[PDB]
Amino acid sequence: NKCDVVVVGGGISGMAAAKLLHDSGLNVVVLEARDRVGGRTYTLRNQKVKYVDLGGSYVGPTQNRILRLAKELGLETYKVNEVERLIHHVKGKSYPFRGPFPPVWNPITYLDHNNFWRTMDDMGREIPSDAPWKAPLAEEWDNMTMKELLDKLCWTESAKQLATLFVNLCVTAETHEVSALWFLWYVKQCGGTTRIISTTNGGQERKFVGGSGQVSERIMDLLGDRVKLERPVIYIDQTRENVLVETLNHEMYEAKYVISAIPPTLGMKIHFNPPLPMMRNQMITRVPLGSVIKCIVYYKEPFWRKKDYCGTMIIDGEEAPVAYTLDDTKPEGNYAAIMGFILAHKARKLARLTKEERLKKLCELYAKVLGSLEALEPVHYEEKNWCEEQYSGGCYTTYFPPGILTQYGRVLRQPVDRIYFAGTETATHWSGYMEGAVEAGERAAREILHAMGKIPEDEIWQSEPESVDVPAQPITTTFLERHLPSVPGLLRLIGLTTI
Amino acid sequence: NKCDVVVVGGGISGMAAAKLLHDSGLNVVVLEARDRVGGRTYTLRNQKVKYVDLGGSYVGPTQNRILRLAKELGLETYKVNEVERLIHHVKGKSYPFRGPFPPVWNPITYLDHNNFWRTMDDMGREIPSDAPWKAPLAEEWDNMTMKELLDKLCWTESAKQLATLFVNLCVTAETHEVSALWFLWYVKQCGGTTRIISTTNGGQERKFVGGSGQVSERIMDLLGDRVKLERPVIYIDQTRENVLVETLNHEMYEAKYVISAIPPTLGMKIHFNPPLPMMRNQMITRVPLGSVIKCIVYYKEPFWRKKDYCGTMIIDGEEAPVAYTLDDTKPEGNYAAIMGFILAHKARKLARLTKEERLKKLCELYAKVLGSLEALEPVHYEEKNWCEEQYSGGCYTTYFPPGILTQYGRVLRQPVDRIYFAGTETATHWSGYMEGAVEAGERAAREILHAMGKIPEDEIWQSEPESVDVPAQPITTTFLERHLPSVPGLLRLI
Numbered sequence A: 001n002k003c004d005v006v007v008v009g010g011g012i013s014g015m016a017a018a019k020l021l022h023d024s025g026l027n028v029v030v031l032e033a034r035d036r037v038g039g040r041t042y043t044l045r046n047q048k049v050k051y052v053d054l055g056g057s058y059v060g061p062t063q064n065r066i067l068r069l070a071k072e073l074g075l076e077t078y079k080v081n082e083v084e085r086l087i088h089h090v091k092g093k094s095y096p097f098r099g100p101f102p103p104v105w106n107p108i109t110y111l112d113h114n115n116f117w118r119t120m121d122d123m124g125r126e127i128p129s130d131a132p133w134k135a136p137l138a139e140e141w142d143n144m145t146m147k148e149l150l151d152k153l154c155w156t157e158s159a160k161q162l163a164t165l166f167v168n169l170c171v172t173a174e175t176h177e178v179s180a181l182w183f184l185w186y187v188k189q190c191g192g193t194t195r196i197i198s199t200t201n202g203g204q205e206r207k208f209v210g211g212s213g214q215v216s217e218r219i220m221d222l223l224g225d226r227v228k229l230e231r232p233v234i235y236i237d238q239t240r241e242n243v244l245v246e247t248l249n250h251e252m253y254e255a256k257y258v259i260s261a262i263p264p265t266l267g268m269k270i271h272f273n274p275p276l277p278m279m280r281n282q283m284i285t286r287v288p289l290g291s292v293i294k295c296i297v298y299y300k301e302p303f304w305r306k307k308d309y310c311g312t313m314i315i316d317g318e319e320a321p322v323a324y325t326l327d328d329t330k331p332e333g334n335y336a337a338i339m340g341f342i343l344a345h346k347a348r349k350l351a352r353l354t355k356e357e358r359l360k361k362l363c364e365l366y367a368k369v370l371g372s373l374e375a376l377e378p379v380h381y382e383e384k385n386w387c388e389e390q391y392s393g394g395c396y397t398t399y400f401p402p403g404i405l406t407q408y409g410r411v412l413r414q415p416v417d418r419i420y421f422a423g424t425e426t427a428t429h430w431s432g433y434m435e436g437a438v439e440a441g442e443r444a445a446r447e448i449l450h451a452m453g454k455i456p457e458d459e460i461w462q463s464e465p466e467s468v469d470v471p472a473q474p475i476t477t478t479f480l481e482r483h484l485p486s487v488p489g490l491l492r493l494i495g496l497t498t499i
Numbered sequence B: 001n002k003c004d005v006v007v008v009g010g011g012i013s014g015m016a017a018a019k020l021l022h023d024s025g026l027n028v029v030v031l032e033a034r035d036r037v038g039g040r041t042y043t044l045r046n047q048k049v050k051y052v053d054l055g056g057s058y059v060g061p062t063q064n065r066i067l068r069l070a071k072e073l074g075l076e077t078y079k080v081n082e083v084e085r086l087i088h089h090v091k092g093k094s095y096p097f098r099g100p101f102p103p104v105w106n107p108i109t110y111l112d113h114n115n116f117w118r119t120m121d122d123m124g125r126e127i128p129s130d131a132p133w134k135a136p137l138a139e140e141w142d143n144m145t146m147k148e149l150l151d152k153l154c155w156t157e158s159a160k161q162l163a164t165l166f167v168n169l170c171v172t173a174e175t176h177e178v179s180a181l182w183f184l185w186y187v188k189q190c191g192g193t194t195r196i197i198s199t200t201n202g203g204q205e206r207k208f209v210g211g212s213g214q215v216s217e218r219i220m221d222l223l224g225d226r227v228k229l230e231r232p233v234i235y236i237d238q239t240r241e242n243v244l245v246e247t248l249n250h251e252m253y254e255a256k257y258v259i260s261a262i263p264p265t266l267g268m269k270i271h272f273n274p275p276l277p278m279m280r281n282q283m284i285t286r287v288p289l290g291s292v293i294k295c296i297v298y299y300k301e302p303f304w305r306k307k308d309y310c311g312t313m314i315i316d317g318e319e320a321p322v323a324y325t326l327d328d329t330k331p332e333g334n335y336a337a338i339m340g341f342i343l344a345h346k347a348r349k350l351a352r353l354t355k356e357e358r359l360k361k362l363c364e365l366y367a368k369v370l371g372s373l374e375a376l377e378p379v380h381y382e383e384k385n386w387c388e389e390q391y392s393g394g395c396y397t398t399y400f401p402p403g404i405l406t407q408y409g410r411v412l413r414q415p416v417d418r419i420y421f422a423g424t425e426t427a428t429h430w431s432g433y434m435e436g437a438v439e440a441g442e443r444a445a446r447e448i449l450h451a452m453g454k455i456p457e458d459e460i461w462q463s464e465p466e467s468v469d470v471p472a473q474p475i476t477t478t479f480l481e482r483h484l485p486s487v488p489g490l491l492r493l494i
C-alpha cells in the first residue's frame, strides 16, 4: 500500500533503482508484471544445461556499473572462449581468422571495409552520448535509414553485406527499419565499433557464472517482500497529494514518487491520469523493440576446438538462420554448447517452425560452417523467442525508426511530474545492455533523492570506477587504418593524377 | 455484464459494428474510454461557431458507406466551397488557379510534376487494396521511405516540394517517416491521386450539416444504455468459455465475441490473457499515428470570395505554420471561417506556443496568402491538437514506417481467437477515413455473424451501392498526361 517510491518493473534497472533507494533508507516497493524478476534477462536452470542465459548474457570491459553491482551481490564472471580461430562464412565457404574484424585481402574491398568501420566511428564522434539530437547533422542523419547510409558508404557488396550483418546483430532490426542517427549514436555510446564487436577486449568478453538472472534475483532476496510479483501496473494517478499506482490484480499502491523501469513503449500498457504530455504520449507509440530468437545447441564435447575453431561464426547470407554464434560451453569445459541468434526478419520468418525444425536447421548450418558432421549430433536444445513477450515487446532493446530520435528523443528521460524514467533505453553509456540498465536505474533513483533534497544536483549523475577484475584495454588504430583512402577517395586521387 | 458481443471503442467503426449486430438481434455493449463517443471525430457546439468539426470532417464521392450510414441516421451533406479560385503560394507569392492540381509553366517542371502524380498512380496499380504486401515489388518499396522515393523521382525542387506537402497533408507525417509501399497503398485505396486530392469530385467535396460527430452520437442514441462511457478497457481474458472484458472503473463484461475498434497501437493499453500471438504483440508497437493540429479561424464575412478566392490555399515552405486550408463557412454563408491543418513536425514544433500565439501566426499567414488585411481581424478561433489524445494517439490515422507493412501487415485484421478487428486502419477502401471506419466495423461485425453460423462466408465482405446524393464522376486523364515523357525519359530521348 503506502511507501516512498514505487518502482514499476523488476528488471535490472528497476532492481538497481530499488536497491539504491532502499540502501538510502527509503521505503520502496517493486511492482513486477511477471511471476519472476529479471525481465530481458532470464536464466533457465535444469539438469541438462545446469544454467543458461536465454536473455541478456554478455558483459565486458568498460561496463563497470553492472560489474560492480554483480560483484557486490557475490557474483563472478568468466571469459567467453576465444582461444582458437573465429570463422567468417561468406558465399558458402568458411574463412578462419583472428582479431575482432573479419579480414579481407582484395585491395579495393580492403579500402572499403576499412572506410566503413572508420566512418561509423567518425560520425559517432559528432554525436553527444547524452543528447544525440544535438549532433550538427542530427536531422540529416535521422531522416535516413541505415540502409540508405550503407548504400552511400559501401562501394563493395562485401562491405555492405558485412555492415548489414553488423546492424542486424547489433540492434536486431533491418537496416531499412532504423534511423542512421540513432544507430550511429547506439554504437558510439558503447565506445565505438571495435569495443562493441569484440569478444576479447569488448562487450562479449564475459558472462556471469551461474547466469545474469542472479543479479535481479539477488536484489529481490535483499528486498524481500518489497518485490510484488504478478503485479502488472495498469494505472497511475498523479492528481492528488500522493501518487496512486494500481495493478491488474486490483491492488493500490501509494507513493511520493514513481520510477518507470519498463521499455518505453510498454508505458502504453498504463492508463495515465492526468494524460501524459503530448510529446511522451506520441513517443511511446514510435519506439518498437527488435526481434530475436536466442538459441543454444548442446553437444557432448566442444568438438570445434579440436579443429582450432573457438566457436565464433559470422555467417553471411539470407539462407543462414543464424548470422552469429559464440561458444557457450561452461568455464569448466562441460555442457558444450553453441549459442546463436536468429535476427530481425528471420526471427519472424522462422518462428513459424517447430522447436525441432529450428534445431535441425541450426545443426545443418553449423555442420556446414564448421565442416563437422559432429554438429549434426546435438544432445540438448534450448531457445527463447523474445518477440512473443507481452512484458518485453522484443529484444535486445528499443530501436528508433527514421525521424523519431530528433523529434521525440529529448522526452525519453524527462520526468512527468513525480514519475522518473529508468530502463536501459534511457542510459547514456551502453544503453541497450545490462550496463545501461544499471546506469539508468541508479540515475533515476538519484533524481528522486535530489527531488527530496537528500542529495545535491551534481550527484544525480555519478561516474563509475573501473573494474579491477575486468580492466579495459584502450581502442587503438594503425597509421594505415587512419589514413588509407576510401574507394571514392582513391578514385578522386586517380582523377587528379590523370588530369 | 453478460452479452453477445463487446465492442471496444465508440468511434464510427465501433458504433457501425455495434449497430449492425444490434440490428441483427444480438445483445451488444460498447465500451468507450472517453466521456463522449466519436473518437477521432468530434463536433464542438457553442454560440460563436454553432458547430465545428475538430476531427474528421470531409466526405465525398466513392465514400458510399459513410454516406449511407449518415443518411439512415437522418444527416445531410453540403458542398465545401470551391466556386472561386484556389491559391498555390510558392516562394512568397500567391498563384491563383482552377482544377485540382496546382499548375506549373516551366516545361521541364511541367514534365516532372506530371510524371510525379502519374507515377504514384502507376505504382498503385500494382498494389492490391486488400493485400499491399502482395505487390510484386512489395519488399523493395516497403524498404524505402517516401523521402527516398521522392529523391529518385523528382528531378525538380518544385515537384519535390509539392510532393512533400502532398505526403505531409495526406498522412500527417514526414516523407522520411513513412514506407513508400504503405503510402502508395494508402493513395491507391482511396482511388488514386486525383480522387484523394480533389474537393469537387473528391474526398473533400462535402461536410455533414451539423457535424460528423452526429454519426456516433445518433448511433449512441439508438443503442441507449448499451453504450458505456468512461469505460476504458484494460484487460481481455479468453482462457474460458466466454470472453471476459475488464474496464479501468472495475467493471467486468462477459461476451461470446469481442470487436476491437480502436487504433491498432492502442491495443497496447489492454493486457491480454493468454498473451497475443508474437506477430500481433510486436505489430502493435510498430504502428504510430500522425501529428496534426486542426485550426479554424472565424471572420465576420467570407471576405476572400470578394477577391475571387474560394479559401483553398496550398502553401509551400517551412515557415508557413499551415500548409493547407479550406473554406469552413457554413452552407448558409454565415460563421465565415478558414480551416487549416498544422502538419507533422510543425504540429510538434508549434504546440509549444499558446492558442493566442498560434492564432496570430495563422492570421498573418492568411493575410499574406490572401493578400488581405481582413485576415488580421478574426472574430473567433477553435483548434484541437490530436497529438495530446491518450485514446487516439494522433490523427488522422496510423502510418507504417519502412519495413513494417510487409512484415506485419497481414496481422492487422487477423482474428485472435474470439477477438475480431475493426477500426479504419483495417479497411480496404478509404482506410484512414470515416468511410474506412464504417467498412471495417461492418465487416468485423459480419465476421462474427459468420462465426455464429448466421450468414455464409461470401457475405462477410459486402459491396455498397453508389450514393444517389453524391454520385462519383470518373477520373480521367488527357493523352498528353498519359504519354508525355519524364525528365529522365526526355533526356534518354535526347
Ligand SMILES: *[C]C1=C([C])[C]=C2C(=[C]1)N([C][C]([O])[C]([O])[C]([O])[C]OP([O])(=O)OP([O])(=O)O[C][C]1O[C](N3[C]=NC4=C3N=[C]N=C4[N])[C]([O])[C]1[O])C1=NC(=O)[N]C(=O)C1=N2/[C]=[C]/[C]=[N+](\[C])[C]1[C][C]C2=C(OC(=O)N([C])[C][C])[C]=[C][C]=C12
Binding pocket: A008, A009, A010, A011, A012, A013, A014, A031, A032, A033, A034, A036, A037, A038, A039, A040, A041, A054, A055, A056, A057, A058, A059, A100, A101, A102, A165, A166, A167, A169, A170, A171, A196, A197, A198, A203, A204, A231, A232, A233, A234, A261, A262, A263, A266, A269, A270, A292, A293, A294, A314, A324, A386, A391, A392, A394, A395, A396, A397, A422, A423, A424, A425, A432, A433, A434, A435, A437
Ligand atoms: C532479450 C535479450 C537477448 C535475447 C539478448 C541480449 C539482451 C536481451 N540484452 C539486453 C538486456 O537484457 C537488457 O538491456 C536489460 O535486461 C534491460 O533491463 P531493464 O532496463 O531493467 O528492462 P527489462 O529487463 O525489460 O525490465 C522491465 C521489467 O518490467 C516489467 N514490466 C513490463 N511492463 C510492466 C512491468 N511491470 C509492472 N507493470 C507493467 N506494466 C517486465 O516484466 C520486466 O521484468 C543484452 N544485454 C547485455 O548486457 N548483454 C547481452 O548479451 C544482451 N543480449 C544480447 C546482446 C548481443 N550482442 C551483444 C551482440 C553479439 C555480437 C554483437 C556485435 O558484434 C558484431 O556485430 N560482430 C562480431 C560482427 C563483426 C555487435 C553488437 C551486438 C552484438
Ligand SMILES: *[C]C1=C([C])[C]=C2C(=[C]1)N([C][C]([O])[C]([O])[C]([O])[C]OP([O])(=O)OP([O])(=O)O[C][C]1O[C](N3[C]=NC4=C3N=[C]N=C4[N])[C]([O])[C]1[O])C1=NC(=O)[N]C(=O)C1=N2/[C]=[C]/[C]=[N+](\[C])[C]1[C][C]C2=C(OC(=O)N([C])[C][C])[C]=[C][C]=C12
Binding pocket: B008, B009, B010, B011, B012, B013, B014, B031, B032, B033, B034, B036, B037, B038, B039, B040, B041, B054, B055, B056, B057, B058, B059, B100, B101, B102, B165, B166, B167, B169, B170, B171, B196, B197, B198, B203, B204, B231, B232, B233, B234, B261, B262, B263, B266, B269, B270, B292, B293, B294, B314, B324, B386, B391, B392, B394, B395, B396, B397, B422, B423, B424, B425, B432, B433, B434, B435, B437
Ligand atoms: C483527428 C482527425 C483530424 C484532425 C482530421 C481528419 C481525421 C481525423 N480523419 C480520420 C477520421 O476521423 C478517422 O478515420 C475515423 O474517425 C476513425 O474511426 P475509428 O476507426 O472508429 O477510430 P476512432 O475514432 O479512433 O475510435 C476509437 C474509439 O476507441 C476509444 N478507445 C481507445 N482506447 C480504448 C477505447 N475505448 C475503450 N477502451 C480502450 N482501451 C476511443 O476513445 C475512441 O472513441 C478524417 N476522416 C475523414 O473521413 N475525413 C476527414 O476530413 C478527416 N480528417 C482529415 C482529413 C484531411 N484530408 C482529407 C486532407 C485534406 C486535403 C488532402 C489532400 O489533398 C492534397 O494533398 N492536396 C490538395 C495538395 C495537392 C490529400 C489527402 C488528404 C487530404
